[PDB]
């Protein structure tokens, strides 16, 4: 779910960046550091809505850097276990289905996929279809999946999609 | 001393214990209280062997012991160990051995779930199903490990789990006859 | 420890405000407008583009006034902040469908009243 929260970050500013525009560099440096980095506690960070306040810059003894604590408001998305969220299928494979939800990517194991669904290797575009063809799931389609679990590693978060529950899959 | 308690004590001792324990219980069945020395002469067992058996019988509290100290005819102190069966304490301990085994079914089942479903045989390192996707290279089209540069197979991890399930239903058969035995405790 | 269905969230996700996809798109669009200004500045990361496309795809309201009107009406109804985002995002057509998706929603209001709330969102929703 998309959440707008205030985050605490520490910026170590090199002495070369001192002088005029010091705060501007701190603000600019904050965007580069935060953007493209994700943490399990708060999830992926998209962009910084605003900077609440720049704290006092404590000079590091001996190191020469100045540690600037920054309070900034940014919007983050985190996968919640037992939650249904719309997803877009990127690649289709017999082993499993890969789907992307914004920056977050979810992987669907074959076991979690409903039994009636079967891989369609014969078709040029890989897809899952039923015997009666009532429901067809292929690449680049909006589907609903349940987040069975979340694992975070190397500052990257990903979930497991299960279509066993009702009101799931392509609608 | 109702005969139900006497009958069961023989049944349980002959089931989970060797003939040595059963023979000792027979002496205590015939006589409510018997000296340790008297039992040794009757059974002709070794001193260490009898003590170990008695200690085991004391471990499960099937029979209790009391120490009597007196002066012998020649003046030397005599310390005789008198062993007697305590049915009231026996029933509680033997009953405890039921629920543990009955509840042991759940504990054993958890052991199988611990084993990982996905494993890498070439590198002999368990592979998490999720970590496989990150380790999996989309260009290659199949999951692989960079360090050993070889394909992975999770079929091997499947076989051990199936066997353990048979060990469970097979486990229950052991405690089925004993369930009938312990019904004599309540009667 | 945290379950959306059980309305259980960590201490951090207590005062957090949930923004709708349409509202999220508006803020992201403002960032894009600021991106054009102050030339030679840092280019927006691909993650920003991914979210901007996602919110735009699911945008249930293409008019700023409609989004405000929906929020104002939803404010009157005593609904949890997290549930409001789901209500305005999924936009279930039937009351029963909404209840099934969110087990915690059961008992909050009457079934007849629940259906009316969903129907109102449809009227504000713009179909293209
Ligand atoms: Zn390997």
Surface-to-core class of residue C34, CB atoms within 10 Å of its CB (0-12 exposed, 13-18 middle, 19+ buried): exposed
Residue B116 carries which DSSP code? -
Residue A140 contacts residue A88 (beta carbons within 8 Å): yes
Quote the distance between the C-alpha of residue A16 and its chain's center.
34
Question: CB of A87 within 8 A of CB of C58?
Answer: no
Q: How far apart are CA B26 and CA B7, in angstroms?
A: 10
Q: How far apart are CA C94 and CA C118, in angstroms?
A: 7
In this structure, are residues C68 and C75 in contact, taking their beta carbons and an 8 Å threshold?
no
Segment 24-83 of chain A within 8 Å of chain C by CB? 28, 31-32, 35-36, 41-42, 44-47, 49, 75, 77, 80-83
Within 8 A of B131 by CB-CB distance, chain A residues are 153
Residue from the list C12, C42, C85 with its beta carbon closest to the beta carbon of A32: C42
Helix-, strand-, coil-residue percentages of chain C, each rounded to 5 = 60, 5, 35
Phi, psi for A169 (deg, rounded to 5): 85, -175
DSSP state letter for C102: -
A with B: how many residue pairs have Cβ under 8 Å apart? 18
Residue of B nearest to A160 (CA): B130
d(CA A164, CA A168): 8
Least Cα separation, residue C99 to chain A (angstroms): 12
Name all chains with 3 or more CB-CB pairs below 8 Å to chain C: A
Final residue of a structural domain among A50, A80, A110: A80
**Residues whose CB is less than 8 angstroms from the CB of residue B24 and which lie 6 or more positions away in sequence, other chains included:** B39, B43, B50, B53, B54, B57
Cα dist. A50→A2, A57, A70, B133, C55 in Å? 17, 19, 11, 35, 20
CA distance A113 to B168: 30
How distant, in Å, are the alpha carbons of B136, B156, B164 from that of B159? 24, 6, 9
CA distances from B67 to B58, B70, B101, B144, C112 (A): 14, 10, 34, 71, 81
SS (H, E, C) C53-74: HHHHHHCCCCCHHHHHHHHHHH
Q: How many CB atoms lie within 10 A of CB C106?
A: 12
Same-domain status, A51 and A7: yes
Contact call for residues A42 and A72 (beta carbons, < 8 A)? no
A94 Cα to the center of ligand 1, angstroms: 21
d(CA A78, CA A106): 12
Q: Which residue has the tokens 């099934």?
A: C100
How far apart, in whole angstroms, are the C-alpha atoms of residue C112 and residue C94?
10
B127: contact with A, CB 8 A cutoff = no
Domain end marker among A59, A80, A101: A80
Distance from the alpha carbon of residue B146 to the mean position of ligand 1, in angstroms: 7
Q: Scanning every residue of chain A, which has its alpha carbon at the shortest distance from the alpha carbon of C16?
A: A5
Rounded Cα gap, residues B105 and B168, in angstroms: 7
Kindly state whether residues A20 and A90 are assigned to the same domain.
Answer: no
- Give the Cα separation of C37 and B49 in Å (integer): 94
User: How far apart (Å, rounded) are the C-alpha atoms in residues A164 and A140?
Assistant: 21
- B141 C-alpha vs ligand 1 centroid, how far in Å? 16
CB count within 10 Å of CB B128 equals 15
Question: How many whole angstroms from its chain centre is CA B104?
Answer: 10
A42 in the same domain as A105: no
Task: Give first-to-last CA distance, chain A, whole Å.
Answer: 20
Cβ–Cβ under 8 Å, residues C49 and C115: no
Decide if B134 touches A, using CB distance below 8 A: yes
- To which H or E segment does residue B119 belong? strand B119-120
**Is the distance from CB of C98 to CB of C92 less than 8 angstroms?**
yes
Q: Is residue A103 located within the same domain as residue A163?
A: yes
Cα C8 to Cα B150: distance, rounded to the nearest angstrom: 43
Of A91, A95, A158, the CB nearest to B130: A158
CA pair distance C18, C20, nearest whole angstrom: 7
Q: Do A97 and A165 belong together in one domain?
A: yes
- Residue-range domain boundaries for chain C: 1-128
d(CA A163, CA A149): 14
What are residue A159's DSSP bridge partners?
A106, A150
Q: What is the resolution of this structure in A?
A: 2.9
Number of domains in chain A: 2
Query: In this complex, is the C-beta atom of B31 within 8 Å of any C-beta atom belonging to chain A?
Result: no
Q: What is the whole-number distance in angstroms between the Cα of residue B151 and the centre of ligand 1?
A: 7
Distance CA A5, CA A71 (A): 10
Kindly list the distances between the CA atom of residue A133 and the CA atoms of A120, A125, A129, A143, in Å, as whole numbers in the listed order.
12, 16, 6, 16
3-state secondary structure of B129: helix
Give the span between the Cα atoms of C33 and B87, in whole angstroms. Answer: 88
Residues from chain A that touch B155, judged by Cβ atoms under 8 A, are none
Domain boundary residue, one of A31, A48, A80: A80
Task: Extract the annotated binding site of B.
Answer: 120, 123, 145, 148
Nearest to A8 by CA among B69, C12, B164: C12
Contact at 8 Å (CB) between A158 and A104?
yes
Buried b (16+ CB within 10 A) or exposed e, A136-147: ebbeeeebbbbb
- A75 and A97 within one domain: no
Q: What is the DSSP letter of C105?
A: G
Instruction: List, in sequence order, the alpha helices (H) in chain B.
Output: 3-16, 19-30, 36-43, 47-59, 87-114, 129-135, 158-186
Is the same domain home to A67 and A90?
no
Q: Is the CB of A36 less than 8 angstroms away from the CB of C44?
A: no
- DSSP-assigned letter for residue C107: T
**Do residues A6 and A28 both lie within one domain?**
yes
A71 and A106 together in one domain: no
What 3-state DSSP class applies to C33? helix
Task: Give the rounded distance of the alpha carbon of B106 from its chain centre.
Answer: 16
Range of the domain at A68: 1-80
Pairing of strands A38-39, A58-59: unpaired
Chain A hits for C100, Cβ within 8 Å = 166-167
Method used experimentally: cryo-EM
Residue from the list B130, B131, B138 with its beta carbon closest to the beta carbon of A91: B138
* Ligand 1 center to A81 CA (angstroms): 30
* A4 alpha carbon – ligand 1 mean position (Å): 41
Work out whether strand A156-162 and strand A104-109 pair parallel, antiparallel, or are unpaired. Answer: parallel
Contacts 24+ apart (CB under 8 A), C41-50: C41/A28, C42/A28, C42/A31, C42/A32, C44/A47, C45/A35, C45/A36, C45/A47, C47/A35, C47/A36, C47/A44, C47/A45, C47/A46, C47/A102, C47/A103, C48/A35, C48/A46, C48/A47, C50/A100, C50/A102, C50/A103
Q: Indicate which of B117, B129, B139 best probes the interface with A, i.e. most A CBs within 10 Å of its own CB.
A: B129
A168 and A109, same structural domain?
A: yes
Other beta carbons less than 10 A from residue C94's beta carbon? 12
Place of tokens 């090199």: A14
Contact list in A for residue C12 (CB cut-off 8 A) is 5, 41-42
Distance of alpha carbon A143 from alpha carbon A90, whole angstroms: 11
Structural contact between residues B181 and B8, judged by C-beta atoms closer than 8 angstroms? yes
- CB of A134 closer than 8 Å to CB of A120: no
Return d(Cα A119, Cα A128) in angstroms, integer. 5
- DSSP string covering chain A: -EEEEEEEEEEEE-GGG-STTHHHHHHHHHHHHHTT-EETTTEEEEEEEEEEEE---EEPTTT--EEEEEEEEEEEE---TT-EEEEEEEEE-SSEEEEEETTEEEEEETTTS-TT-EE--SSSS--EE-SS-SSEE-SS-EEEEEEEEEEEETTEEEEEEE--SSS-S--
Q: Report which DSSP code applies to C43.
A: P
- Judging contacts by C-beta atoms under 8 Å, the chain C residues touching residue A28 are 41-42
Could you tell me which residues are beta bridge partners of residue A149? none
A98 shares a domain with A70: no
CA distance B118 to A163: 22
Local structure of residue C8 (DSSP, 8 states): B
Indicate the angle between helix axes B36-43 and B47-59, nearest 10 degrees.
120
Residues of B in contact with A154 (CB under 8 A): 134
């Amino acid at each position: 779910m998309f959440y707008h929260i205030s985050l605490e970050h520490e910026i170590l500013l090199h002495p070369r960046y001192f002088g005029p525009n010091l705060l501007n560099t701190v603000k600019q440096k904050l965007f580069t550091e935060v953007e493209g980095t994700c943490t399990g506690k708060y999830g992926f960070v998209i962009a910084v809505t605003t900077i609440d306040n720049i704290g006092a810059g404590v000079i590091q003894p001996g190191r020469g850097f100045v540690l600037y604590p920054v309070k900034y408001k940014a919007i983050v998305f985190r996968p919640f276990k037992g939650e249904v969220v719309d997803a877009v299928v990127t690649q289709v494979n017999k082993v499993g289905l890969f789907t992307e939800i914004g920056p977050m990517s979810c992987f669907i194991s074959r076991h979690s996929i409903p039994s009636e669904m079967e891989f369609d290797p014969n078709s040029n575009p890989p897809c899952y279809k039923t015997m009666d063809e009532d429901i067809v799931i292929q690449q680049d389609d909006e589907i609903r999946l349940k987040i069975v679990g979340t694992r975070v590693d190397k500052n990257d978060i990903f979930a497991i999609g299960s279509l066993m529950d009702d009101y799931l899959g392509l609608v | 001393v109702p005969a139900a308690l006497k009958r069961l004590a023989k049944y349980v001792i002959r089931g989970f214990y060797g003939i040595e324990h059963a023979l000792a219980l027979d002496i205590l069945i015939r006589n409510s209280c018997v000296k340790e020395e008297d039992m040794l002469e009757l059974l002709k067992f070794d001193r260490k062997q009898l003590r170990s058996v008695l200690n085991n019988l004391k471990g499960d509290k099937f029979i209790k012991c009391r120490m009597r100290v007196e002066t012998a005819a020649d003046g030397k102190t005599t310390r005789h160990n008198y062993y007697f069966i305590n049915y009231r304490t026996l029933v509680n301990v033997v009953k405890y051995k039921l629920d543990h085994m009955r509840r042991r079914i759940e504990t054993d089942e958890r052991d199988s779930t611990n084993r990982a479903s996905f494993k890498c045989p070439v590198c002999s390192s368990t592979f998490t199903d999720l970590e496989a996707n990150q380790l999996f290279d989309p260009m290659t089209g199949t999951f692989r490990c960079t360090f050993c540069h070889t394909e992975v197979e999770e079929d091997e991890s499947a076989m051990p789990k199936k066997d353990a399930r048979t060990l469970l239903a097979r486990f229950n058969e052991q405690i089925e006859p004993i369930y009938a035995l312990l019904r004599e405790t309540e009667d | 420890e945290e379950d959306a269905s059980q309305l259980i969230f960590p201490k951090e996700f207590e005062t957090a405000e949930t923004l709708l996809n349409s509202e999220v798109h508006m803020l992201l669009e403002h960032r894009k407008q600021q991106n054009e200004s102050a030339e030679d500045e840092q280019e927006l990361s691909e993650v920003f583009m991914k979210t901007l496309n996602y919110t735009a795809r699911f945008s249930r309201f293409k008019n700023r006034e409609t989004i405000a009107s929906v929020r104002s009406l939803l404010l009157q109804k005593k609904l949890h902040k997290f549930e409001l985002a789901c209500l305005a995002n999924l936009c279930p057509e039937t009351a029963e469908e909404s209840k099934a998706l969110i087990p915690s929603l059961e008992g909050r209001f009457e079934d007849e009243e629940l259906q009316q709330i969903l129907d109102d969102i449809q009227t504000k929703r713009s179909f293209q």
